[model samples]
Target: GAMNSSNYAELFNNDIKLFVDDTNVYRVTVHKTFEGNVATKAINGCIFTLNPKTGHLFLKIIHTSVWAGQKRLSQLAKWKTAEEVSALVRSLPKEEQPKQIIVTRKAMLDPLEVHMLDFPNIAIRPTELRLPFSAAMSIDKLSDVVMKATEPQMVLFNIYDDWLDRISSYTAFSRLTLLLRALKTNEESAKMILLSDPTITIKSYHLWPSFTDEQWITIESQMRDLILTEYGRKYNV
Candidate 1:
C-alpha cells in the first residue's frame, strides 16, 4: 500500500529547509541547523519529507556526496543519477539505509520517474513512490498541484543558475505567474520562500546572475500575495 500524504505529514511536522544549485539540483532538510545562507556538511543530501498525498516519509538525494565521497564522482567521471544511487544504497547494511527514496524526472529527459525500495527488515514499508506530478514538472504542472492542493502551506521555489533565462523568457515567466496565482488561493495562506544567492561557491563562475531593478520588481509582485519571505529572514511558520 502507498503512504498517505496526511500520515507522512505527522512525522515531518516541523520546519523545512531546502538547498539548491544553479544546476537545478537540490537538497531538502527538515528542522536542521543551517549556518547563514550556506549548506554545510551537516546538511544531509538525503533529507526526508512526507508525501503530500500519503504523508509517508520520502527520501530525496540531491547530491552524490550525500551518500558517497569525491571518489564516487571521480570514478564515474560524472555524478550518478538518483536511480543509480538508490540501487547503490540498496546494497548497504540496514543501519545505513533510508526508508523511502525520491528521484526527479525531467520531461526533456525521463518522465514517469518514480521509484521505491522496500525490504522485510527495512525500517519503513517499501511502497512504490507516487508524486503529485512528474520529476520534469513545469509551471503548468505546478499549477495543477496547487489547484488540487488542500490547505496548502509552505512553498519553497528554488531558482537554479539558469534562472536568468527562465525569468527572462516569456513562456517561463508566464507559467510562473500562473503557478503563483494558484498558490495565492490556498485557504491557509501559503508561505513562499525564494531560495537564491547561494553562499557556497562550487566554482569561480557559479555565481547567481543579477536581476535588474525592473525584473526584481516584476518578480516580487507576482509572489507578493503568496507571502514571499526573504531567505535568512526569520519568520513564523
Candidate 2:
C-alpha cells in the first residue's frame, strides 16, 4: 500500500540514492543524479531522512560535467549549462535569484568533480502535493493484492491501512500542532516519505505521539537507532 504515485517515486530514484549516515547526519550521492534543467534551482525529498533528534536538515545540488580538453560540457544538454546556468540563474526573476547559487568541487566517474550549486535563501514553497493514487488501484484492489500475496504479507497491509486511516482522519489543527512540535518535519517531508495517497496535505502523515516531553526523547532514540543501524550496516559502528 505504498500509495505514493509513480512519478514521485521516479523523482526520488532519479535524484537520490537514499539511506541514513551517522546519528542525524545524512550523506547522499548526487553525483550520478539524472541530468535535468535546474528545478526551482529547488526541491521535495526522501524518507529515512527525518532527523528526529534536532529536526534540522539541508540540501545541495551537485552539478557534474565532463571536460573534453578545455570545453566544459554539461548534461543540461540543449538549453542549460555554464553560460546556460548563468543566464538561467541570472535570468531568474529577483524572487528566484537569492533562491540562488554555490558550487563545490569533488569527484565523479573520475576522481572527477562534484560541483555543489547550493541555491540558498529562497522562501519555503507552499506545502501541497497531489498524491495521484489511481482509482483503478482502489483500496479494495490493494487489499485483494495483499491477501493474494499471502497471510504473512496480509498483516502488514492492515497495519499500513490503519496508519493511513489514522492520518487521514486528523483535524487540520491537530495536524498543525504535530507539524510544529514534531519539530522539523511538516507537510512536505511527511508526504514524500510515506508516498501517501490522496491530495497529501500537511495533514497527510505524521508520527503518533506517545504523549509527554518524552515524545521528543522517543524521537531522538529512533533517530539514534536509524543512525546506528545505517552506520553499522555500511561500515562498523
Candidate 3:
C-alpha cells in the first residue's frame, strides 16, 4: 500500500506544533523524516504549519534554518546532478566509503540551498545502505525547488560554493534548492531573522522557540564537522 500524507501527519499528533494560518487550524512538525520511516541525525528544522482550509500545502516553513554559513555567493557551479553524485559515491567500496558526502555537501552549501537542491532523497534519508525510493521520484524537479527561493528574504539561500561543477567537495546546494520552494510566500506577516550591518534581529513575526537551545547547538556542531572534515577534504587544487 502506498503511504499517504495523512499517514505522515498522523505521526505529529503528540509533538505537533500549532500555529494559526488564516483562521484554518492544522497540525504539523518541523522534521518530516523523523515522522516517516527514516533515520536522521539533526532535528534543527523550519516552522511547518498547516492549513485546513485548502489541502494544497500540507505544510509551510515560516522560518528558515539558522546557520551563519548561509551568507555566501551561490551561483551555478558544475555539480554532478544528484543522480550523478549518488552513482559515483555508490561505486566506492564500503571500507573506502566516501565521507558522508550528502552531509558534507549540506555543510558547505548555503543552508537554504542545502534544503532545496537534490532534495527529497536527502529529505527521506536512507533507511538502508541504498538510497531511498524518494530519489527516483525527485528526478526532474530541481526547477520547482529553485522557484521556492523566489521570495526576497528567501532568495539569498542559494549562495554557496559551486562544488557541483567539479567532482570534489561537499555543500548542500541541492538541499537548499528544495527548501527555497517550501517557504510560505505570504506578506501577511514576516517571521524571519534578518542580518543587517552589525545587527542581527529576529523579525516581529518570527518567534524563536525558547525551547530549542541545546538542540540547535548540537545541530550546528554536526553541520560543522560535515563541512570541515567530509566535504572540505576534496583535493580540487
Candidate 4:
C-alpha cells in the first residue's frame, strides 16, 4: 500500500530478514500455517519489497485478508513478521536464493496508528461543539475527534453547534441516526459539512439500548423539541 520502505520499519519494532537486488526488486517470503476450514499455514510469498521511490529499502505487506489470520491484529502480526525478516536480511545475498525467516513475536497496530504514521496530512475544518466542558474533558479520545473538527479552514467543512447540542446530549444509536439524517452529500465536496466523525464508530460499537421502536419514536420527537426550543437548531434534520 505504501511505495516507501521503512514504512514497516517505522510502524513496527519487530525483527525481520529481507531480500533486495540491484534492479530495485524487493521481496520477503513467509511460509507458515494458518487456520482455515481445512486451510493450512502456507507460504505467503510477495510479503514485502524494497521501494522504487524513497529507496530507504522498507517493506510492504501485500495480502488477501483471509490468506493470513482473519482478525485485525492477527493480520498485522503476519505483516510485521515479514517486515522484521526483511530488515534482518538487509546485508545478505539476494542472488535468487531463499531461506527461512522465523519471527517469534509480533505487533499490535490500530487504524489510529497508521494515520499517525504515513497518512499524517489530515486536513479538517474549523468547528465548535456544545458538549459541556467538564463532560468533554472526561473522555480520552473525544479530543482526537475534536482536533479533526478544529483545523483552520484546511478542508473547509463545518458542523453547526446548534444541531450539535442535541446530538451531544444523546448516546450512540440516537446520535448516529440524527446525524445521518442531516447529511448533505454522499461524496466529499469542497464545501462539505459534517455532523459526526469516525470516532462515532467507536461510540456505536460501544453502544446498546432498551427503547422499543415506538418509544424510540417518542424520544425522537422529544429531542426535536429540545433542539428546536430548549436547546437550539438549524433545522430539525
Candidate 5:
C-alpha cells in the first residue's frame, strides 16, 4: 500500500531499474541507457548482487560501451565491454567473493571483450528472467514489485550517485520516510547504501540529506541519538 497519494507521482519521475527476489536479495541498475547518441547512453550497465544474509550486500556492476576513434562516442549501438568488472571483483575482500553465480540464459555479453566475472562456479538458467517491470520502468511500481515477488525479509537498497539529490526535497523526503516506515511495520529489515565519497550505509530507519560534510554529521548524530533512545541499541549507520 502507498503511504501518500503524491508518492505515486514522485516515483514516476525517478528512473531506476530494480529487481528483488524471495531469497532476500535485490539488484539495481542506475545510469543506464537514457537516450541514443547522447552521453547518457554510454553510461549503460547493470548491477547484480547477493546478500551475505548478515545486514550487508556485495555487488558487481558491469559497464558496456565502445569508444569511437579514441574519443568517446555517444551512440546506442556498440559491443559490450567489461573493463571495470574484473577490477571491481578483485577489489572485494576474499571472503566476500561469491562461490557461485546464477545467470540468465541469454544474459548480454560480447565475445570480443573479456568476460565480466571469473567465478569458478556457475549456474545458468534455460531462459532469461522476465522482471515484473520493464527496464524503462519508473519507481512508482518498485515497492509493489518487491512485495509481490519476495517474502518479508531483509531488503537492501543501493543508492547511486544522483538518487539522493533527486529525492532530497521536503515533499520527496516525507514520502521516502513513509515508505521506509511502511516496510519496517511489515517486519522487513530494510537497509540503505549510498554511493558517495565514503559510501554511506544506513542500517536503521532514518532519512537525512547528503548535502554537506558538516550538515551530514549533524543530521547523523541527531538520528543516532533518537534511535538509541527508542530502541536502546546502537544501530549501524
Candidate 6:
C-alpha cells in the first residue's frame, strides 16, 4: 500500500535519441514530456528501452508537442528545425533533458483520476481509463506487485529469502552467537574486498545472517550451490 497520498504532479512524453561512440558518452535529441493531469482518466508513464548492461537510452516516444518540438517553435517561431529543439533540451542539465516515454496506456484511468482520489472534496475529474488493475480504475480495488525481474537480482532475493527462513527457526543464545560470527566473517570479507578489486564477483543482495550460525551456514550452502548452477560460478569457493 502507498505510504502517503502522492499528488498528481505532472505527465508528458518525450523522445531522446542517444548515439554512442568510443569518445563521447552523452546523448543528443529533441524531446518533450507531457506533465500533470490532462484528464481524470489518463495515466502517464515513461518507458525506457535501454541496454541493461550499459546505461544506454534507446528509442523513446515524445508524447507532447512541447517536449517534442511544437512548443519550442510556438515560443521561438523565429527558429525552426530539429537542431533548434535539440539545442533547447541540451541547454538543460543531463538529468533535466526530456526523454520519450509512455505517458498513459490506451485502456485505463489517467493521472487526473489518481489525483482526484486524494482530493474528493476538490472538483472531480473524469478519466478515460477503465482497466481492472489500474490505480484509479474503480477507486477501491487493490493490487500488489513484487519486482525482482532481472536474473542477477532475482537470484539474490531468492537465495536470501530461502536462507533466512531456515535460519530463523533456532534456539536462544545459539542464534545470537551464530549471527555474531556471520557478521564478523562478512565484515572481514567486505574489508578485504574493499582493499582489493571490489569487482571480483557480483555482490549478493540481502545476505544478512540473523539467525543461528550453524543453521544459516546449512541454508547458505544450498544457496551457494543454486547460484553456482544458475550463474555457472562457485562464488563461495
Best by TM-score: 5
Residue 81 of model 5, lDDT score: 20
* Model 4 Cα lDDT, one tens digit per residue, 177-197: 343232221212101222122
Residue 173 lDDT (model 4): 23
RMSD of candidate 5 to the true fold? 17.6
lDDT of 3 at 28: 23
Who wins the lDDT comparison?
Answer: 1
If ranked by lDDT, best first, what sequence of candidates would result?
Answer: 1, 5, 4, 6, 2, 3
TM-score of each: 0.24, 0.24, 0.18, 0.19, 0.29, 0.15
lDDT of 5 by residue, 18-123 (tens): 1211111222233534463323322222333322122122222222322224332211122222233334345667764433222221222331123533543322
Question: Backbone collision count in every prediction?
Answer: 12, 4, 36, 14, 0, 31
Query: Could you tell which candidate, 5 or 6, scores higher by lDDT?
Result: 5
Residue 156's lDDT within candidate 6 is 9
Q: In model 3, what is the error at residue 144, expressed in angstroms? A: 19
Runs of candidate 5 exceeding 4 Å displacement: 1-81, 109-118, 122-128, 132-137, 140-237
Off by over 4 Å in 4: 1-117, 120-208, 231-237
Candidate 2, which segments miss by more than 4 Å at Cα? 1-88, 104-217
Instruction: Give the poorly placed runs of model 6, Cα more than 4 Å off.
Output: 1-210, 233-237
RMSD of 1: 18.7
Deviating ranges (above 4 Å) for candidate 3: 1-86, 92-193, 201-237
Residue 99 alpha-carbon offset, candidate 2, angstroms: 9.2
Cα misplacement distance, residue 129 of candidate 6 (Å): 41
Candidate 1: list runs displaced more than 4 Å: 10-86, 91-93, 100-118, 123-237
Worst 10 residues of 6 by lDDT: 137-146
